[PDB]
C-alpha cells in the first residue's frame, strides 16, 4: 500500500482516466505513471463494459468486499471505512432525456488519499459537470477537492430538482384559482418523485456529514467546512421537500374535497331535477289511464287546468326550496 | 482587514447606509468615516440594482462563499460561521401588498462586528420597523442591538401573522353553527400558508437559538438572553402553528365528511322519493296499455279506485318507512 | 431589592392582596407592612383595570422585560429566569357555561422569594380554589408551596376536564350500538378542544419539569418532589389526550365509512329499484304506443299475459340477483 | 415504624394477606406477627369496602401522598420513589365475558421492604395466577419474587391479549379472498382496544425500566435481569401493537376503497341502465302522443319497424362502449 | 461442562449437526467427541419432534430461561446475554408458494463459544443456503463466522424480497398509464407485507447492531465490522421499505382519487342524461293526456312541431352547458 504503478490502473475499456496536478490538470494516464498522494489520479468507468468488470473484480489494488460492492448492487448512499480505504457512493438524478420515474442514478467511488475509482451504469450528468469544468483547469486540485466538487455538482443539480418540484407545486395554486382540477393522474407522479427523493437525499445528507464529521487523513479542514455546509445545503433542500410532501398532503386531500363539492353541486341538479320528476306520478297518474269513468269530463278545456296546477305544484315546492331544502 | 475607510463601502446604487452611534440613534454615512467596533455601521443594499450587484460581487470585505450567497438564491434561513465572518440569512412575510401565497421574504446579513450589511430583494416589514426605530433614536445601539432588534421585529410580525391565521381558523366555527361550509377552495391557502410557515420558522428557530448558543465575539450576554427567549418565543409560536395544522386536519376532515353526509342525506331524499315513485311506472303498467281485453270495465268509476289504492300503497310502505327503513 | 414597603405593593384596584403566614392561614395586606421571605405577601390583579395597568407597568418592583409580559399579550405558557426574578405564565381550564370553545384561560405570576404578582383577565378556578383554601388555615405556607398548590388545583381540574372529554369519548361507543351516529358537527368540538388541550398542556409539562430542573431559593426539595410527580400527573394527562386524538382519529374515520356504507345501502335500493324499473321500456315499449297495426290483437284478454310476463322478467332477474348479484 | 406487628395489618374487610417464606409458600396472618424483610408479608384488599378505606386512610405505615391516590385516582400506571417507600401502580386486562371495552383493570401496589400491599377494584386474573402459584407452593420467594411473578403474570396475559387481537386481524384477510367485507363496526372496537393498549403499554415498559435502573434496596440482580428482559418482552409487545395499528390502518382504508368499488359496480349498472333507458323516454316521445297528425301511419305494421330501431340504438351504443365507455 | 461429549448433544431426531473445521468444512457427529472453541459444534433441530422436544427441554448444558425460549413460542427478533450464554433469535423469509401472508419464518439460536444450536419449526431457506455453503467447503470458519454468514444469507434473502416488492410497486405505474386501476384487493397484500417487514426488521436492525456493539469472546473484530455494515446493509433495507409505505400511501390515496374521479366524470352521464330525463313530463306532459279540450288541434301535423321543439329545448340548454354548465 505504498507503491502504485500506472499500468494496472490503465484499463482499455476505461471510459475516463486522469492525473490531478493540484489545479484541475487534464493529463490522461500512461503505463509508466507515478501515483501517490502527491499525484492523485481520477478515474471513471462503466461496469457494464467487459474489462471494466474484469478489472473491477480482479485488480490487486482495492480490497475484496469493495469489489462486488462496486458493480451495481446497492440502492442506497453508503459510506464505509476500510482503514486506509474509503468507500463512498451517492445518487444523482438523471437518465436519458426521458426517465422522470426512476430518479435513481448510481455512482460508486472507492477512494483514498492516493487513487480514486468511480463507476456508473447510466450517464451521470453531475460527473459530466465535474468533467466539464476541469478542461480549463479551474476544477479540483486533488481527491479531496474532487469529492467536494462532485458534492457541489450533486447539491446543485439535486437542489435544482428540488426547486423544480417546488415550482411544479407552487404552480398548483390553480387548486383555488378557478378551483381547476390538476390533470388526471399527475399528483402521484411528482409526489412519488418527491418521496423517493426523500429516501435518497435523507441518507445522503448524513453521508455528507458522516464524511465531514469524520477525520479522513487527506482532506483539508476547509474542505470539511465547505463539506459541512454543503451537507446543510442538502439539508434545507430536504426540509423543502418534506414541506412539499405536506403541501401535496393538503393539495391531494382538498382536490378530493373539491371534486366531492362538484358531486354536491351535481346533486343540486339531481335534487331539483328530481323535483321535475315529481308531477310525473300525476302526469300519467291521471292522464295515462284507460278506465270507464269521469276523470275530467265535467268541465270543458281541461288542458290549461293541469297546465296551471302542475306549476302550482312546481312553484309551491320551489317556494319550499327557499325554506328548508329537505323533507 | 483591520480598519475600513468610509468611501470603500460607499455604494451609489445602495438603498442607503448609516452610522450607528451607540445611543440608539443613527447618522448617515460620510465618505471619510472610520468603520470599527467604536463606530459600527449598517449598510443596506438592494441586490436587484446594478452597482449594488457589482459591489456585492467585487468588494474585498467578505470572503468568496458569501459573495454569491448575498445574491438571492437560497430558501435557507441559515447561519454560516466564517471565523470572524458571520453570515446570517432570515425570512419575513410580505411580497407586494397582495400576495397571500408566497409569504417568503429573503433578507440577508453578512456580518462582522465592524460593518453589518443587509441585502433584500423586495421590501421587509421588519427592516422598515427597525428603520423607524433607528431614526426614531432608540433603535439599535450596536450590531448586537441590531440583531436583537431585527429579530424582535421578525418575531413580532411573524407572531402577529400566525396570530391572524389563528383567528382565521378559530373564526372557522361555522362547523358547529349551521354546519356552514367554508368557501370553495379556502383551506388550501390557510393550510398552505400554515405549513410553509412551519418550513420557514422551524430552521429559523434554531438559527436564533444557534446564534444564542455559541459565543460570538461581539454580543452582550444580555443580548444572548434576549436572543434566547426570543428564540423560544418563535419556538412556541410554531407550537401554535402545528397545533393549527392539527386543527386544519380535523377541520378539513370534518368538512369532507359533513358535506359527504349532506350528500348522503340527498340520496336519502332520492331513496324515499324513489320508493314513493315506485307505482308510477306500475300505474302506466296497468293503465297505459292498448289491449283487446277488459282492464277494469266490470266496475264503473275506477278513477277513484286507483287514486285511492296507490295512495294507501304509499301510506303502507310509508308505515314500513318508520317501521323498517330497509329492504 | 433588599426590603419592600407596604404601599408599593398596595394597589387600590387590586382584586386580592394577602399575607401568607406560613401556617397555611392568611392575613390581608396592610399599608405599613415590611414583607420579605419571612413575610411572603400575595397579590391578585386584573390588568384590564386602568390603575392595575398603571401599577402594572410603572412599579419599580419588577424589570422592564417582564413589565409588558404581565399585561396580557401571551398566547402561551412560559418560565423565564430573571436572576433573582422568576416569571411563570401558565394556563387553566375555565369560563362560564358558554365558553367551551376558547379555553384561553391565562394566569400570570411574576415572583421571587419575597413577592408574587398573579394577574388574570378572565377568572381562574384554580386560583379561585386556593382563594377558597387559603383562609381556612390549610392553604400554602409560602410562595413555593403556593404555586405547588396552584398546580395542584389546575392540574386536577384540567385532569378532570380531560377525564370529562374522555367520558364523552367512551360515551361514543354508540359506533357499535347499531352504528348510532354522533350529532351533526360534534366531533370537531371534542377533537378541537382535545388538540388545544395538547398544545396548552405540552409546553406546560416542561414548564413544570423546568421548575424542578434547577434549584431556586424559595422552594423545598420536597416541593421539588411534589413538582416532579405533579408534572408526572400532567404528563400522563398528556398521554391520555394523545391516545384520545388517536381514538378520535379512528372514530372520525369509521363514522365516514358508516356514511359510505349507508350510502351503499341507499344506492343498493336504487340498484334493485332500477332493475324493478327495467320493464318501463317494454311496458310502454309494447303498450303505450300508437301505431296502425296488430301488437296483441290476435289473442283475447291479454292483461294476464303481460302480468305473467313482467312477473317472470322481474322474478327472473331477481333469481339472477340470487345467482351472481351483478351483470 | 420498625418491627411491624400483625395487629397493624390485620384488616377484617381485606380480601386476604399472607407471609412469604422464600420457597413460594403461604401462611395466613395472626395478630402477634413479626413483619420484616426476613418474613415479608403481602396484604391484599378491595378498597371499595368501608373498613378497607378506613385502614387505607388511617394506617401508620405508608405516607400521606400515597394514602388517597392508592384508592382509585390514576387513569394510568406509574412508579414513585418515596425514599424507603416505593409506590407502583400497574394495569392488567380482565373482566367478565362482556367487558371487553374498558380494559382498565387496575393494580395499585404500595411497596415497602417488609410489607407489600395490593389493592384492586375489580378482580385481576394476574394476581389470581400468582395466588395459584403460591397455594401451589412454588410461587414468590420474597417481595422481589413477588414483583417478578406479578410482572410475569400480567405480562403473559397482556401478551396473550395482543395475540388475541392479532389473530383477530389475521383472520381479517377474507377482504382479499373474494373481498369479504368485515362485519358492521368491527374494526372500530378492536382498533379502539389496542389503541388504549398503546395508552397502557407505553406507560408500562417505562415503569419497568424505572424498576430496571432503579437500584432498589430489596431487588436482586438476577430478578433485575428478569424484569429487564420481561420489560423488553413487553417492548416487543407494543411494537407488535403499533405494527397492528398500522395494519388496521391499511385494513381500515382498503375496506373503504373496496366499498366504493362495490359502489362503482352499482353505479356502473346505473350508468349503463340509464343510457339504455334513454330510448324509453324518446319512445314515449314519439308514441305517447295524442295529436292530429301522421306520426307513422303511412306504412302498415310499424311495430316491428320501431322494435328494430330501438334494438339498433341499444346494440349500437353497446358497440360504442366497447370502444369508448364515454361520450 | 468443559469437554462436553458429542453424545450429550447427539439427538436421534435432530435434523442434523456438524463440526466446524475453521475452513468452511463439514464433519458429522459421533458419540466420542470433544467439543470446545477449537472444535465448534453446530446443531440444528426441529422442536416439533418429541425426542428433540425432550432434549432441548431437558438437556443440562443450556440454562433454564432459554429452555422454553428455544421451544418455539413467540415473535422474538431479539438477543439476551446469559453471561457465557447468548440467546439470539431472528426472522427470515421462506414458505412454499402459498405463504406470502404469514412472513414469520422463525429461527432461534442458543449459542456460546462452544456449542451453538439452532431450532426452527418450518424450513428456513437461509439456513439451507449456509448448509449449501458449508457442504462444499466454503462455508463458515467458526461460530462467529457461522453467525455472520447466516446473517449474510438471511439479509441477502430479506434484501432481495424487499427489493422484490419494491419493484412490484414500481410495476404500479398503471396509475398514470391510462390511469389503470390496480387489481381488486391487491394493495392490502403488498402494503401489508411492507408494514409487517417494518415490524420484523425494526428490531432486527438493532439485534444486528446490538450484536456488533457487544464485545463477545466468540467473535472477531473483523466480524464486528462486517456485522456492523451488514447491520446498516439491512438498515437501508428498512428505510427503503418505509419509503415504500409512503409510496403505497400516496398510491393508495390516489387510487381512491382516481376511482372517485371515474365516478365524477361518470355522472356527466347522470347530468346531461338527467336533463334529457327532465322532458318526460313535457313530451308526455302535453301529449299523454286524455282530456276534453283542444291541446293542439288548431293546427295540422303536430308531430313535426314537437319533433323540432324538443330539439330546441335540448340543444338550447345544451348550449347553456357551454355557457355556465350549471343552474
Author numbering:
A (entry chain E), B (entry chain D), C (entry chain C), D (entry chain B), E (entry chain A): 1 to 327
Provide the publication's sentences verbatim.
ZntB is a distant homologue of CorA proteins, which are well-characterized magnesium (and cobalt) channels. By combining all available data from us and other groups, we conclude that ZntB is a zinc importer that is driven by a proton gradient.
The apo structure of ZntB was obtained by single-particle cryo-electron microscopy (cryo-EM) using n-dodecyl-β-d-maltopyranoside (DDM)-solubilized and purified E. coli ZntB (EcZntB) (pre-treated with ethylenediaminetetraacetic acid (EDTA)) and resolved at an overall resolution of 4.2 Å. Analysis of the substrate translocation pore revealed a wider profile in ZntB than in the magnesium channels TmCorA and MjCorA. All three proteins have short extracellular loops between TM1 and TM2, where the family signature motif GxN that forms the selectivity filter is located. In contrast to stringent removal of Mg2+ from CorA channels, the depletion of Zn2+ from ZntB is likely to be physiologically relevant because intracellular concentrations of free Zn2+ are extremely low (i.e., in the pM–fM range). Therefore the symmetrical structure of ZntB may better represent the apo state than the asymmetrical structure of CorA. The cytoplasmic domain of full length EcZntB has a strong positive electrostatic surface potential (resembling VpZntB), whereas the potential in the isolated domain of StZntB is negative. Furthermore, the shape of the internal pore between two forms is different possibly resembling two conformational states.
